[PDB]
Design a protein around this ligand. Structure first.
Ligand SMILES: [Ca+2]
Ligand SMILES: [Zn+2]
Length: 306
């Protein structure tokens, strides 16, 4: 009974408290709001390629993932984000003209933050076995490689065991943009990372990382969130073109799944921000991309200028 469980929202409550994150998060949403209404939409017509470093923390070598495994994930992302995935053909025709190309690929930096030529994969032996939504795997003191600077690279943590504060075993999380630097990255368990090696289905397509990436582009789950105290229909992903559902669908669904009306269009289970299996989450919406655009210009302005 392995269910998809994303702790990124569990991070989000705990993010609020220092209020340093609160200042940035308000500024971050006004851009993503003003972009939403249409106000300013000067669009870049060049895709941006983004440097990425993977931190493997292995308690055992079997946990330590092969490099070939790491690449299979890297490739599948660059297929997913430019409308290149073979899976895009599974979207119902109702939304064929709504599928989007984020206009984004990424790479494993030739250079580490100090300048020397680097692979892009740090491997750290750790004595710990479990890891939490406490983000303790990110920091060095807790058996997890120090995060590389947030403006130069996008940090990655891959470990064997990921758990929630509730205890329910998670596949990964993500820290929202404008967040404090040393956590400004995403973590995915080793069995959801890539298309081979220790990667296992229904996370062998590696879309599990794709999903928690979207939180790094400031994408809410389609349903709003369960962090949010509300009647389930009044929590929304602030994306107009995705049908506002309230219940995540896991596994693979039968078209259509009707949540908070939106019938007969049904839920957008094909969206990577739903909890479906990897082979059924295939695409990103035009609205979502527009939200990504707003995350890139103001919060992440560093990466565009490279
Ligand atoms: Ca929506
Ligand atoms: Zn998530």
């Amino acid at each position: 009974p392995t269910q998809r469980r994303c702790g990124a929202m569990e991070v989000h409550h705990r993010l609020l408290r220092s209020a340093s994150y609160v200042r940035e998060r308000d500024q971050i949403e006004n851009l993503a709001l003003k972009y939403k209404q249409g106000f300013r939409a000067i669009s870049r017509m060049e895709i941006v390629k983004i440097p990425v470093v993977v931190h493997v923390v292995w308690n055992e070598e079997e946990e330590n993932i092969s490099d070939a495994q790491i690449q299979s994930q890297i490739d599948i992302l660059n297929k997913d984000f430019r409308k290149l995935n073979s899976d895009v053909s599974q979207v119902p025709s109702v939304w064929s003209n709504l599928i989007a190309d984020l206009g984004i690929e990424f790479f494993l930096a030739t250079k580490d933050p100090n300048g020397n030529q680097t692979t892009g994969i740090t491997r750290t032996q750790t004595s710990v076995t479990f890891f939490t939504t406490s983000d303790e795997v990110k920091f060095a003191s807790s058996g997890g490689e120090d995060a590389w600077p947030a403006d130069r690279y996008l940090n990655i943590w891959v470990c064997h065991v990921l758990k929630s504060e509730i205890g329910q075993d998670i596949l990964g999380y993500a820290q929202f943009p404008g967040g404090p630097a040393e956590t400004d990255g995403v973590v995915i368990v080793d069995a959801a990372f890539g298309t081979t090696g220790t990667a296992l289905p229904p996370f062998d397509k590696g879309r599990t990382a794709t999903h928690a990436i979207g939180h790094w582009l400031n994408l809410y789950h389609i349903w709003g969130d369960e962090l949010r105290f509300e009647d389930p229909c009044s929590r929304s992903d602030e994306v107009d073109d995705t049908p506002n559902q309230a219940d995540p669908n896991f596994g693979c669904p039968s078209y259509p799944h009707v949540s908070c009306s939106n019938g007969p269009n049904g839920d957008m289970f094909m969206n990577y921000m739903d909890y479906v299996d990897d082979k059924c989450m295939v695409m990103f919406t035009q609205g979502q991309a527009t939200r990504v655009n707003a995350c890139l210009d103001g919060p992440r302005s560093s990466f565009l200028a490279r």
